[PDB]
């Protein structure tokens, strides 16, 4: 079924609001709502919505600092692989990483924009990229929407934010798994 598949996503998220921050400011929940709430506003369509919903998922459902799980780019974009997610949600999710990486090396003042949590994982998620690194992400046809996933990733840590709840969003994680 579908209505049970995102069941158990609404399930998880509200879960990440028991955890441990992971060296955040805002609990795992609202870090994953006001990245939805951001990519709703901007009037992005739905699959980016869910990707920024969902980027940092890999952290909670199986390291780094600790502030996080290895490779929680690569784990959320395979557990949603496994419940008929598309593969451009699960690129996104995975290219969360990538995406921090290209602006730090980019822009020599990315650095200040990043959470501690953000900055200290970056020590695990392999630093400021090399020459030839960040030439293969300029190549990838979601480059765009890739920076633009992040930017909400590090504008989603306000704390004084009202955002809507995951049920505000399961029509829509509904609707992704018809489509697949
Ligand atoms: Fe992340
Ligand atoms: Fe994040």
New binding site residues.
Partial sequence: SNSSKVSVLISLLEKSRDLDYIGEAINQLE?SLQ?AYFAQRSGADNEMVLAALL??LGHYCNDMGGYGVWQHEKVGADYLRGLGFSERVACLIEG?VAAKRYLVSSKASYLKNLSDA?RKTLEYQGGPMDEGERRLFEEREDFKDCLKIRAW?EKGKQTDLKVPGPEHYRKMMEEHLSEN
Avoid: A, N, T
Wanted: proline letters at 0%; hydrophobic letters at 0%.
């Fill in positions: 870090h990245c980027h940092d969360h953000s990733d």
